[PDB]
Amino acid sequence: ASVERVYQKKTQLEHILLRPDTYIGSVEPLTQFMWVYDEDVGMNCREVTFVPGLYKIFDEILVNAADNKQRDKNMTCIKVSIDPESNIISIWNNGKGIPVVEHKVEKVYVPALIFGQLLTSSNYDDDEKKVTGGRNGYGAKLCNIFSTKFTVETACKEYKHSFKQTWMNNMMKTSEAKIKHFDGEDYTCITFQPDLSKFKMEKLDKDIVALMTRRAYDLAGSCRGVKVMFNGKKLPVNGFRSYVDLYVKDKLDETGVALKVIHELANERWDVCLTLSEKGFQQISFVNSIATTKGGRHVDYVVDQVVGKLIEVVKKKNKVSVKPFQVKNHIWVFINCLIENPTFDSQTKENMTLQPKSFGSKCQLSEKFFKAASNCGIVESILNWVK
Amino acid sequence: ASVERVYQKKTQLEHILLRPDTYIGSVEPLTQFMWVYDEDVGMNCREVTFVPGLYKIFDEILVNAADNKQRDKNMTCIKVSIDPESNIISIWNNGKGIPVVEHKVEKVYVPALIFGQLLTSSNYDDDEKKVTGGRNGYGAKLCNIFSTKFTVETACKEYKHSFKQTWMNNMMKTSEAKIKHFDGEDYTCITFQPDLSKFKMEKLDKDIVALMTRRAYDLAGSCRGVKVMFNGKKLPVNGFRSYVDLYVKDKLDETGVALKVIHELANERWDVCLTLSEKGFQQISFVNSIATTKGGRHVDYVVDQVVGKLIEVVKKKNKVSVKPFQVKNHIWVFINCLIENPTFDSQTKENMTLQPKSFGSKCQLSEKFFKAASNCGIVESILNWVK
Ligand SMILES: Nc1ncnc2c1ncn2[C@@H]1O[C@H](COP(=O)(O)OP(=O)(O)NP(=O)(O)O)[C@@H](O)[C@H]1O
Ligand SMILES: Nc1ncnc2c1ncn2[C@@H]1O[C@H](COP(=O)(O)OP(=O)(O)NP(=O)(O)O)[C@@H](O)[C@H]1O
Ligand SMILES: [Mg+2]
Ligand SMILES: [Mg+2]
Missing domain, CATH: 3.30.230.10 (Ribosomal Protein S5; domain 2)
Known part of the structure; x- marks a missing residue:
């Protein structure tokens, strides 16, 4: 093997596909006991088989939606939709959208920069002491890279425009964004079809859906002042204590006495x-x-x-x-x-x-x-x- | 705050300094009970205060030396030196050096490529089923970035030359490598002065030295067929069982009976x-x-x-x-x-x-x-x- 075959340099985008694990976690199946939210029993702890990286790309978009509550404390709602048959996941939030304007340094529309280029973030100035989950400028691009189709729609009254752009084929193909006049109530909606071949999967099966569903319940419990809807129905969790109740309110200890929850x-x-x-x-x-x-x-x-x-x-x-x-x-x-x-x-x-x-x-x-x-x-x- | 101040793009090198944690671990102090090798008591478990990222940049170079046993099974020795007064750490290994030749694609000397540019590795072809620790093409560059001075010396008889190059100021400054005829016994030696200001430290204190020393003992225990020297003296560990003995051979259980080690x-x-x-x-x-x-x-x-x-x-x-x-x-x-x-x-x-x-x-x-x-x-x- 020649020097050039042995000693190789990778681009950032190549490195993500070659070494996905430090970006999104394992891309191979994992079986373990854990808490999920099932269609038949609701919250329960059982053996689950799933691919961590697929769960994570969903999580990145979900936490980004929660983070908007920090950008706009008037935000009230996140809506999550999962359709296994079409392989379409969407995460929508209200509160302020993303400025639909050309970035004067990067010479692209702001949403195209921060969803389509690595190492882009509004969370890079730590003199602001923010309590967002976002820190690194990767998460949304990682979901895009691991999706066969990834659409960003955002509408921002302040800048008087809406934006819609679709990427395809692991962020390698896109086309001109649709820009329109907008003067309504702001929102952002991320709609993606995960590239199941990257995870050696045929479909979003019950286990991954139950994990993603539980994550929506987590959000209803953790994100103060934000209601969460899943597949068109509000989740009946209105704060952290009601979320905790899903685990312990109906439980006994081994002596048959109800758990005392403080x-x-x-x-x-x-x-x-x-x-x-x-x-x-x-x-x-x-x-x-x-x-x-x-x-x-x-x-x-x-x-x-x-x-x-x-x-x-x-x-x-x-x-x-x-x-x-x-x-x-x-x-x-x-x-x-x-x-x-x-x-x-x-x-x-x-x-x-x-x-x-x-x-x-x-x-x-x-x-x-x-x-x-x-x-x-x-x-x-x-x-x-x-x- | 303008759009350009809010939404920022970083280069890879900027991102490492801004977000060191996913590259090297925490750059702030950590206090915890753990196993170290002290000058007074040898192997012992005690409360230690240290900066994980500093420990890690040392670890990256140490594991790289161990990895050379996979490139050349005839390798026999790794020598570690730590001088707190001068702030100089060196890690030397024998077995095959690194080819001292220009890489025909990257148009730089091979050692300069793989120690001075991110995302460079001999471990990127997984069809080889290697048991090296190296996987990502970062570790050596991370040590360089977190050092005020970082020197690579390697000598490779096959290519009939030795190479010495020094980087300074967090990999931001370097100069022409010294290339010489070489026909002796191959080696590589990495000598670095960690940038203690990046870790808010004044000196390599006893705790970090005890952690780095224990890591040399770990290597003597884990790397089959390789002897390890620390500050000029061979470590008296000749295999994994003798390494394990450092923890349990002289220990009793709570009833006063010696631990039975299987x-x-x-x-x-x-x-x-x-x-x-x-x-x-x-x-x-x-x-x-x-x-x-x-x-x-x-x-x-x-x-x-x-x-x-x-x-x-x-x-x-x-x-x-x-x-x-x-x-x-x-x-x-x-x-x-x-x-x-x-x-x-x-x-x-x-x-x-x-x-x-x-x-x-x-x-x-x-x-x-x-x-x-x-x-x-x-x-x-x-x-x-x-x-
Ligand atoms: N739903 C959203 N509403 C508004 N802005 C958003 C939304 N999702 C993403 N963004 C913006 O897009 C940027 C890029 O997102 P992302 O790639 O996830 O990076 P990040 O959240 O800042 N850091 P990380 O998630 O730790 O890699 C964010 O910094 C936000 O400015
Ligand atoms: N002591 C050494 N002897 C020979 N080759 C070495 C030595 N140290 C480093 N190298 C080479 O330099 C390359 C870059 O090292 P490094 O940056 O640590 O990446 P890596 O070890 O391949 N992966 P990682 O450590 O997981 O980021 C390695 O892939 C080796 O080819
Ligand atoms: Mg994010
Ligand atoms: Mg390495």
């Missing part, structure tokens, strides 16, 4: 629920409406407070050694938080790495909350083990 | 040790000499086999329900494995996501190993809990 909205940026776990530590958490399914420093920040206080309570009835991991083993925690300029080790944003001193706010749980935590069965499980 | 080299590509944990599930694992500190499917693949067999043993003395997470809670596992074309969700490569069917080999632990596992205190811990 809750505190510490402040606008920190909403916490907690109950007993009997299958090891569990956490369901959101940072800026991103599902941080591998946790991060926000989870540790909340959990460490609870663990410290519960160790205190146990000690007052111990008289041998109760270690923090043993307490954490009995905790099921739910967190919805807003973090300024969060960091993650991956574009997938499953683990949030920013240290608490940089969050821009604190979550100092009240003594009332800690007392309630001492009554939800965790202490009893530990003390029974101190025998 | 071992099986299932085949050339899978080396496994296992013992009892009393602080929850623990894993120390390597994929292609990468420290997979967040685990991955290789860990799950090994652990699930052990858990399944130990549940069998417990059941034969149970007569209530023993759940897999409870068994895993008592396992400390050590894995050194070689995986073809591994995948990870991050450039940092802490979690290996490739499914076992794609590994290119299997690890089917023997019935002898499972019997030994049933005698290392895990079953006893579980059974005592079934009371």
Whole structure:
């Protein structure tokens, strides 16, 4: 093999298709137990087989819609549609659209720049301490690259125009955008057909649809002041506590006693629920409406407070050694938080790495909350083990 | 704020400095309990404060050296030097050097291409089923970008020349390489001064040095057939079992009984040790000499086999329900494995996501190993809990 065959340089676009994993996660199937929202049973935990990268390209567009609530606090609604037969997914939001105007430096329409060129973002100036989920300038282009058809429609009264442009064939083909006069209520709608061949799939099957549906429920629970519709029907979740109820309101512990679920909205940026776990530590958490399914420093920040206080309570009835991991083993925690300029080790944003001193706010749980935590069965499980 | 201030495009090089986290991990301090190799006590677990991105740029160069054992199986030695006073780190390896010749497509010397331009690699052709750690074509450039001085020296008898080139100021300045006749024993040596200002550090302190030193011990344990020297002295680790001994050979369980450590080299590509944990599930694992500190499917693949067999043993003395997470809670596992074309969700490569069917080999632990596992205190811990 020649020097030129061995030592190769790739373009950014080539690298995404060759090495999709650090951009969207695995493009091969994964089977694991997890929470989904099924047509027959609603929220449930079961074995699911799905391709992470396909789930992620949907997530990128969904979080972008949630992020618009930061650009326009008057936004009220996100509508999600999934049609497996046609292979069409659409995510629509109201509030301010995207300026339909030529960017004077890049010499293209703003929506064409930020959906059709890599490393483009309104989130690159960190002197603004934003609580958007978007950080890197990739997500929407990644969905485009992994779609056979990707359409951006946006309407922005301030700039008096609407914009519609369609890309095809993994962002490699497009045509002139349709620009029209507009003076109505702003919106953005992203409609895409995922390139299932990139994920070795024949169709959007029940498992991936159940995961994408649950993500819409997550959004209804995490994005304050935004109602969510799925396939034309409003989701009956009106805040984080009602979302948490989907997991624990109808559940018993192993002794047949209903789970005691405690809750505190510490402040606008920190909403916490907690109950007993009997299958090891569990956490369901959101940072800026991103599902941080591998946790991060926000989870540790909340959990460490609870663990410290519960160790205190146990000690007052111990008289041998109760270690923090043993307490954490009995905790099921739910967190919805807003973090300024969060960091993650991956574009997938499953683990949030920013240290608490940089969050821009604190979550100092009240003594009332800690007392309630001492009554939800965790202490009893530990003390029974101190025998 | 104007459209041009709000909506911004970044170059690849700008994006690395603006968003370092998905390239090298966090550039802010982190404090946590972990294993390091200290000058006073050797291998020990203690609270450490360090900057992940600094540790990672060192790791990138170290794994590149290990990877040369795949290019040249005759390689025998890696030498690591760290001088905190001068702020100079060097990593040297023998075996084949890098061709000192002009790349006919890129029109630069091969070493200048692959250390000085992004997205350059000999690991981009996956039809070769390689067990190198390198996959993405970033690591060496990331170290260069995060160094105030970065020197590449390589000597390649086949091409009859040696090469030395120095970059400065975060890869933004360089000068003509020194090319000389060479007909000796090949080597490559990477010498760099990390840009401590990028990590808000004044010096390479004891904690970061102890982490980097432990990584050299990891390499002595994981890279078959390669001896490792640190600051001029050979590390007395001659294989994976002797490496594992640094953690467990002198340890007792909480009842005062020595840990029973079991071992099986299932085949050339899978080396496994296992013992009892009393602080929850623990894993120390390597994929292609990468420290997979967040685990991955290789860990799950090994652990699930052990858990399944130990549940069998417990059941034969149970007569209530023993759940897999409870068994895993008592396992400390050590894995050194070689995986073809591994995948990870991050450039940092802490979690290996490739499914076992794609590994290119299997690890089917023997019935002898499972019997030994049933005698290392895990079953006893579980059974005592079934009371
Ligand atoms: N629904 C939307 N409404 C308004 N603006 C949007 C919407 N979706 C995307 N944008 C804009 O398009 C830009 C590019 O989106 P995207 O590629 O996802 O990058 P990002 O969200 O800034 N960062 P990341 O998602 O971390 O890669 C965003 O920064 C927004 O300015
Ligand atoms: N010590 C070394 N000896 C020989 N070749 C080397 C050495 N270090 C680096 N290289 C070469 O330089 C290339 C670029 O290194 P690097 O930037 O780390 O990319 P990579 O190792 O291929 N992938 P990654 O580390 O996953 O980003 C490698 O692919 C090798 O061909
Ligand atoms: Mg985004
Ligand atoms: Mg490398």
